[PDB]
């Protein structure tokens, strides 16, 4: 077999390349939020917490990963910290992603109550709690759920470690039942499915409110034609009363002026209809068309635009969650095979390190998603680049 130093030279070189890109891209994200006040909102404070975790992958997790690949001799609990620190960062990322999804769900479901419920001070408290919990979850093996008590004696002496020390290799010290049941199923898979559900509910909420808007508009147009071809006064009254309710639920969901005019003109044409005079009620109802073409349509178009922007923004953030799953699932699935099929040959070492490298590349991608999908980030990236390096 080829000397190990050659394959490991490739692995280390790729890891360092990834580390550099992870640091630089995510520093740019934090720099962007710091300088641009329009990026300083609660949503982007979770983005920054996420960027901080990805910087930490480059500065600490990748160096740790290089170290533990050598199988060096170490006190088992020190090795455990080297092996598990990345799990703290991945857990922090999951909490940040989950918080962003819930944030966007609150924004679209109760926007009038959003800024009252979701504040920067409460968000900062949530970020601190999530980091603390990330340390507890990621370092649980250090509390005793580990195989430090059953060291591999052959590797210990073949590597020449003193006693009290282990050959520091991930799968020798971190139990597979922890990685599969606790880390993967409970701490990764369940939150991922939760976020899938929240984003589904976001798109459904946006679709329902768009439909409601269109319904109210066609209800105001349909009943206009009804009034224009009516003949009994009860006819005109029935239609006008269905326009008033439609006009009010649209009011809830200088346009306060446009609707005052609309409601007033409906009330006018309504009191005429109650008095029997229909032709003058129809005449009064036909001026609604200019209030509609002058105010209501304009507001219904920008309400449509706002929802479309929220949906497009929700899609961009959902892409972040999908790429997280794509980059981390292979390693988890491999662990499932190692754990659940003792009759299977272990995944080959080159595939293990490909899966590790892939998980680390996730710390590089998010800055690119922001620049391509989010105008405010893209433009802030441009200004920073063209001004502070050229
Ligand atoms: C930059 C600062 C904030 C963080 C860096 C701290 C890192 C380098 C420190 C903190 C704890 C340290 C570990 C503590 C215990 C051991 C066991 C020993 O047998 C080998 C070294 C080893 C594995 C240390 C490696 C270095 C280590 C991981
Ligand atoms: C998108 C998410 C929900 C997909 C997660 C599905 C994972 C848990 C599934 C997909 C393929 C499955 C593996 C397929 C084959 C085997 C071999 C069998 O001898 C042990 C179970 C084992 C190892 C399965 C474990 C569970 C597994 C890894
Ligand atoms: C891109 C993501 C979503 C899907 C990738 C699925 C990958 C991780 C799956 C597809 C085929 C799987 C391999 C199929 C066969 C074996 C041989 C067995 O003795 C060890 C596990 C091992 C080596 C599996 C490891 C996991 C594996 C490589
Ligand atoms: N199984 C596993 N192994 C490693 N590194 C050890 C790779 C290895 C595996 C077997 C072997 O004989 C020599 C080396 N890192 C790992 N990281 C993870 C992981 C992180 C998050 C989810 O899974 N799993 N995982
Ligand atoms: C390190 C983490 C990123 C630090 C953010 C840098 C902000 C720079 C602000 C400035 O250039 O005036
Ligand atoms: C491990 C060492 C590296 C950990 C990352 C360190 C700090 C990340 C930057 C913290 C956020 C600073 C910017 C705040 C802001 O933009 O309002
Ligand atoms: C270990 C390295 C990471 C540790 C601490 C994470 C701190 C980053 C959180 C930044 C918060 C940004 C904000 O609240 O505005
Ligand atoms: C800022 C931190 C700068 C220091 C970073 C150092 C990391 C390299 C550690 C190298 C350990 C080599 C041990 C070799 C030996 O056993 O003699
Ligand atoms: C600039 C930074 C340069 C980093 C140098 C890379 C560190 C290399 C040391 C790891 C060597 C481990 C021995 C090979 C694995 C067996
Ligand atoms: C940046 C630092 C990246 C690489 C640090 C790798 C430290 C390697 C320690 C090897 C110890 C050993 O081989 O016994
Ligand atoms: C400024 C950020 C500092 C970055 C710190 C990262 C440095 C790499 C950390 C771990 C390498 C040290 C572990 C090597 C122990 C080998 C001891 C031995 O010979 O057994
Ligand atoms: C500020 C961050 C600095 C935190 C302190 C970091 C290093 C302390 C850990 C060093 C302990 C290594 C001893 C291992 C041994 O004796 O075998
Ligand atoms: C970083 C700051 C604290 C790091 C503490 C790491 C403690 C691990 C000690 C394990 C051991 O000594 O065997
Ligand atoms: C929920 C968050 C809880 C945070 C505090 C939890 C830590 C309590 C455990 C203290 C560390 C014990 C280490 C034991 C050991 O290293 O052998
Ligand atoms: C990268 C693309 C393909 C990786 C998945 C196929 C590798 C399976 C290897 C199975 C084996 O070597 O026993
Ligand atoms: C996706 C990014 C490109 C991936 C390029 C390939 C990277 C990993 C190949 C690993 C080669 C075998 C590593 C052996 C490690 C070892 O011997 O300790
Ligand atoms: C013995 C066979 C050695 C290794 C099989 C070749 C697999 C190498 C894949 C790493 C390169 C890559 O997929 O990008
Ligand atoms: C090894 C380094 C990891 C590289 C993969 C990570 C992210 C790739 C992002 C690709 C974006 C550049 C393509 C778009 C373009 O510039 O035309
Ligand atoms: Na991350």
Residue numbers in the entry: -1 to 208, 1001 to 1043, 1060 to 1106, 219 to 308
Q: What does the published report state?
A:
The sample-injection device consists of a high-viscosity cartridge-type (HVC) injector and a suction device. To demonstrate the performance of the sample-injection device, SFX experiments were carried out using LCP-grown microcrystals of the human A2A adenosine receptor (A2AAR) complexed with a non-xanthine antagonist, ZM241385, and on hen egg-white lysozyme microcrystals in a grease carrier matrix at SPring-8 Angstrom Compact Free-Electron Laser (SACLA). The sample-injection device stably extruded microcrystals embedded in the highly viscous carrier kept at a constant sample temperature.
A total of 190 041 diffraction patterns were collected from ca 30 µl of the A2AAR crystals embedded in LCP, of which 10 816 were identified as hit images, corresponding to an average hit rate of 5.7%. The hit rate was relatively low because of the low crystal density [Fig. S4(a)], which is common during LCP crystallization. The remaining images showed weak scattering patterns from lipids without strong diffraction rings. Of the hit images, 10 510 patterns were indexed. The indexing rate was as high as 97%. Although the sample stream was chopped by the XFEL beam during data collection, the suction device and a co-flowing sheath gas delivered samples to the interaction point without coiling up. The HVC injector with the cooling jacket successfully prevented any sample deterioration, including viscosity change due to phase transitions resulting from changes in temperature, allowing us to keep an almost constant hit rate during the 114 min of data collection. Moreover, the sample injection under atmospheric pressure did not require the addition of 7.9 MAG or 9.7 MAG to the LCP to prevent the transition to lamellar crystalline phases due to evaporative cooling. The structure of A2AAR complexed with ZM241385 was solved at a resolution of 2.25 Å using 10 510 indexed images [Fig. 4(a)].
